[PDB]
Amino acid sequence: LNIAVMLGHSHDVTERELRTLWGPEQAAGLPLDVNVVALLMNRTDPKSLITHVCDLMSGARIHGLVFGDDTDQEAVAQMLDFISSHTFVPILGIHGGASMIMADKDPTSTFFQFGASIQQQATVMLKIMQDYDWHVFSLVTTIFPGYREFISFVKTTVDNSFVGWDMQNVITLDTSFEDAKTQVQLKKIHSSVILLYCSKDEAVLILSEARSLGLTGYDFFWIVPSLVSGNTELIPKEFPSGLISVSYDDWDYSLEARVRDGIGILTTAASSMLEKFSYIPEAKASCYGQMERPEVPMHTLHPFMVNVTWDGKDLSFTEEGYQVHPRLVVIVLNKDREWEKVGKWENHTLSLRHAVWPRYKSFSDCEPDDNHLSIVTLEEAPFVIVEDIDPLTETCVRNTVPCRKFVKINNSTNEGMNVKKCCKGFCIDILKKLSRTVKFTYDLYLVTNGKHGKKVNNVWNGMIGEVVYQRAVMAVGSLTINEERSEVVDFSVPFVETGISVMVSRSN
Amino acid sequence: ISSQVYAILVSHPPTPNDHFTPTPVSYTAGFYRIPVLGLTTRMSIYSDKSIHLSFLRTVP
Amino acid sequence: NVTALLMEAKELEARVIILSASEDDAATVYRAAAMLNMTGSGYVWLVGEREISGNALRYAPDGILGLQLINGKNESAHISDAVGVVAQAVHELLEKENITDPPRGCVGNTNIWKTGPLFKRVLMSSKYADGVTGRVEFNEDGDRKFANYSIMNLQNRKLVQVGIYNGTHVIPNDRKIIWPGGETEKPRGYQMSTRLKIVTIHQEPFVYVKPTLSDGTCKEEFTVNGDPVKKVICTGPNDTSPGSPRHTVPQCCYGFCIDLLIKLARTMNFTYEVHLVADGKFGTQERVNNSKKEWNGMMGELLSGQADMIVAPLTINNERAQYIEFSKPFKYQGLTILVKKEIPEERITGINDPRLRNPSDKFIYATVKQSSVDIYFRRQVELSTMYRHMEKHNYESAAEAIQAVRDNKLHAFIWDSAVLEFEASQKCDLVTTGELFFRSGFGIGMRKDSPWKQNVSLSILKSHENGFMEDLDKTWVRYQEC
C-alpha cells in the first residue's frame, strides 16, 4: 500500500518529512504498508507530467495518488483522467487546478475531484435567495460552455418548488459587446436581483457596460457562480463594492488537513477491500511498455470508494464522481475591496450570519440611500399580531410581511437571537398600501424595551425613545396624539378616530 | 509540437476501436488551445465544447 | 436478456420502433423480436446507420429501412476538403494586427496561445464551396452541417437504396418499398385495441356499491315503471379500513355513471375492465415525502397510465385542467352548504354570511380532506383562518360527514348542490341552507392524446340536445319527496 503525493511547491514548499510524518504514533491503524513516497512538483507540462507519472509508476508499485497542484491551467484535470484511463491506478486531486469539476468522465476509469458541481452551487444560490425573501429575479447568460445545464436546472427547480418564485425573463447575449440587441436586452430589466453567469473577463465587461446604464445601486443585487470568483487578490475596477458569489472553502480547510483526510480515505478503502477478500491488487507493469489488455477479475477498489467515513467527516463521492458534502462558504466583497466570509453550509442549512442584510455602499460615487425607512411598532391586540414562520416552505405565509424582532432567551441570559418571524394586523396593511404609492423600502423591527411611551425621568422609552433619539424613522402603530408627545415629536394627521371610553356592563 | 504547428489533423487507424486516437490528441492539443480537425470520427461525445475545448470535425 | 422490454412493448398501440444502439445490442434485440413475432404486419421499422453494418446485417428481418452518409469511409476527399478550408482560414487570419507564434516545444512554455482561440473563432465560420464533398459550412456548436444521406431499404438480403435526403428535402425514388412481411401499403401506427378500462369511485346515487351476491349476480331489481336496472361487477378493493387484508373482492356496481357508460358503449361499441380505486380521491395533489408535486387517488392513477377514461364526479378545476382535456359538461351543479334542520334562527347565506366568515369555537364545520373544495380554497387567499380550521377538522368522505352532522359532531357540510338535495329529499332531516357559488359544470377529462375526445363530446352534446339525460334524471334521482 505505497502511495505518492505531489505538492504545490508554492505555499508549503519545505519539510517533505513533515508531510511524510502524518499520524506519527497512529495515523489510522497502518494495516500493512502505509508509507508515503511523496515527491515535489514544479511548472507542469503534459510531457513533464506524463514523464514523471510514468517514471514513478515503474517504481515501488505505486498506488492511488493524491494531487495538489497550485496553478490553474484548467485543462490539467482532463489530462489526469486520461492517465487513469489507460493505467488502472486510482487517482484523486484535492487543491488547485484539479479542483474545478469536469462532469461526465469515462466509465472505465476512476478519478474523483473535490470541488463543487454546478447543481450544488445553483441550489445554494436559490437557498440564499429564498432566505431573504427576494422572490423575483432575471438572469442574463453569455454563450459559454455549460449554459444549457444551468438554464435547464434553474428552470426545473423553480416550478418544482412551492416557494412561488416570480422568475422573470432570461437573457442570452447572442453577440458579445455589440449593443445591437444586448443593450435593449439589458434595458428591459425591471427587477432588482440578477443571476449573471459568464466568464471572468465577460463578467467584467458586462458589469462595466451595465454600470453606466444605472442597473447598479443601493438596491441591485448581483449573484454569480464560483467561476466568476477566480483569484482571491485580483478584484477588478468594474466590480461594485458588495456582491455575492459562492465558492469552495479556501480560508479554512488548510492543505495539511485535506492531505491527511485523503490518505485516510485511501487507507480505509484498502483495508475494506482486503477485509472483503485477501487479494491485494498488483500495479501495472509499465505505462511506457507494450500494449495493455483488460485483465482485472473485478473492479479492484472502485466500488470500495463510496460509503466511507472518517472521524465525523462524511465524504461520500457520488456516482458522477464528486463529494456529496462539499465545504461551501458564500463570500461577499467588503468596503475595502477585500473578500469577506459569511455563512457556511454543513449538512443542509445555510446557517446565515446576518439576520438582516446590511445595505452596502455600492460605490464611492453613487446616489445616497434615501428610500429606506426603519419603521418600528409595538405589539398590541388589534393593531399588530405576531406569528412564526410555518414549516412548509419556511419563508412566511403569503398573506403578511416579515417583521424582525428581539427576543431574550429566558430572563437572566441576554441572548439576543434576532428571530425572523412575520406579522400582520391593521397598521401594517396601511403601511403596505402607503409604500405601494410612495415606493420606499423598509426593514422594520419591533420595539425592545418598554411598551408605548412615557417621559420617565426625562428619558422616553418605547417607540418615542427610538424616534426622539433619531434611531428609527416612522413609528407606525396604535399611537395616541398628545400635546406633550406633539411637543416632543411631530405627528401626522389622523386617519382613525378614538378616545376615552368607559367599559362597564350589565352582570345579568 | 516541436515544430510549432498551427492545426493538427486526425483520422481513424486502419483497425477500428471506436474512440482510439482522437481522445489523446484532442486532450494534448487542447492544453494549448490548438484547433484540430476530425476526418471520420462520428461519435457523439466529442461535440461538446466543455470536455474537448477545441475540436472541429467534417462529418455530422 | 431483453425479453422483458420486448414483452412490455408488445401490449402497446403504436407500431413504430426506432432502435438505435451498438451492433451487438442490435443483434440481441433482433433475436428477441424474432422470437416474440414482433416483425409481423403493421410494423414499419427504422434503424440507425451503424445497426445495419457488420455482424448486425446477418440477423435483421427483411423489411427494415436504413440510412447512411454518402461520402463515408473515404479519406482522400475529406483530406482535400479539410486542407482547402484550413488554408483559406490561415490566409484570412494572417492579415491582422497583433499575431503571435505557435508555442514551440511542449515542455516548458505552458501558457495559452491567444491567437489560438482567435483562430478557432474565425475558422468556425468560413464557407468554401470548391471541394468534392458539397458546400462545407460548420455550424455554431462546432460540427458539420448540411450533409446528405442515402436511404437503403433491405429487400431479400439485397440492399437497394431508394430516395435521397439533401437537407429538409427528402425526395423519394421509384421502387415498391416492401415492408416487413411483403405487404404493399402504408401500414399503420396507432391501434385502437378497444379493451380500455374504467376506474371509478363510489359516492352519491351516481355510483351504487355493495358486496356482490354469492349467486354470481347481485340481484334482479326494477324501478318505478318496472324496468330492470343495468348492472356490472367491478372489482375494486374492500379494505377501506387501514391495515386490513386487501383482497379487491368484486362488489355491486349499479349507480348512474354506469348508466352513462352503458349508453356511451352502445354509442361507441366497445368493452371495459371496470375496477374501483384503491385509495379514492378527486386528485388533491400533494408533495412527496421530503422531496416535486405529487398527485393522488383517482387523478393520480389516471395520469399514471392506469385509467383510460375517468367518467365520474369530476368537478372541473384549474388544478386538474392544466394537463387534461375536459369533455362537454354533462352536469351543472354548484357548491352549497348543508346543516341539520332544527326540530328565530336565521338561514346562513354561505360564506357571504360574516358569521361563517369568522370561525367560532361553537361552529365546527368540515367538508372533506380530499376534494376540489380545498384546492379551490387554497387558490383564493382571502380567508386563511377558515381554511386552517377546515384542514384541522378535515374528514375523509361524505358518509361519515353526514353521520357526524346528524349527531351534531360537525356543524356544516359544503358539497355539490345535487348531492345535498338528493340526500335531504330522501331522509328529510336536514335543510339546504346557503346559496350556490363556484358553479362548476361536471366534465370528463382525458389525457392529451385520446381518439375519443371529439366523439364523446359530440355524443354527449347530442344526448343533451335530445334530452336523454333528463329521462335518466327523472327515472333515477328526482323520484321522491316528503
Curated annotation (Swiss-Prot), chain B:
State whether it acts alone or in a complex, and with which partners, per the record: Heterotetramer; the NMDAR subunits are modular and harbor tiered domains that function in concert to regulate opening and closing of the cation-selective ion channel pore. Forms heterotetrameric channels composed of two GluN1/zeta subunits (GRIN1), and two identical GluN2/epsilon subunits (GRIN2A, GRIN2B, GRIN2C or GRIN2D) or GluN3 subunits (GRIN3A or GRIN3B) (in vitro). Can also form heterotetrameric channels that contain at least two GluN1 subunits and at least two different GluN2 subunits (or a combination of one GluN2 and one GluN3 subunits) (in vitro).
- This one is known as Glutamate receptor ionotropic, NMDA 1
Any idea where this protein resides?
Cell membrane; Postsynaptic cell membrane; Postsynaptic density membrane; Synaptic cell membrane
Q: Where does this protein come from, organism-wise?
A: Homo sapiens
Which family does the UniProt entry place this protein in? Belongs to the glutamate-gated ion channel (TC 1.A.10.1) family. NR1/GRIN1 subfamily.
In the record's own words, the domains note is: A hydrophobic region that gives rise to the prediction of a transmembrane span does not cross the membrane, but is part of a discontinuously helical region that dips into the membrane and is probably part of the pore and of the selectivity filter. The extracellular N-terminal domain (NTD) is a site of allosteric regulation to modulate overall receptor function.
What does this chain do?
A: Component of N-methyl-D-aspartate (NMDA) receptors (NMDARs) that function as heterotetrameric, ligand-gated cation channels with high calcium permeability and voltage-dependent block by Mg(2+). NMDARs participate in synaptic plasticity for learning and memory formation by contributing to the long-term potentiation (LTP). Channel activation requires binding of the neurotransmitter L-glutamate to the GluN2 subunit, glycine or D-serine binding to the GluN1 subunit, plus membrane depolarization to eliminate channel inhibition by Mg(2+).
Associated disease: Neurodevelopmental disorder with or without hyperkinetic movements and seizures, autosomal dominant: An autosomal dominant neurodevelopmental disorder characterized by severe intellectual disability and developmental delay, absent speech, muscular hypotonia, dyskinesia, and hyperkinetic movements. Cortical blindness, cerebral atrophy, and seizures are present in some patients. Neurodevelopmental disorder with or without hyperkinetic movements and seizures, autosomal recessive: An autosomal recessive neurodevelopmental disorder characterized by severe intellectual disability and psychomotor developmental delay, involuntary and stereotypic movements, spasticity, and inability to walk without support. Intractable seizures manifest in some patients.
Gene (UniProt): GRIN1
The record describes its post-translational modification as:
NMDA is probably regulated by C-terminal phosphorylation of an isoform of GRIN1 by PKC. Its phosphorylated state is influenced by the formation of the NMDAR-PPP2CB complex and the NMDAR channel activity.
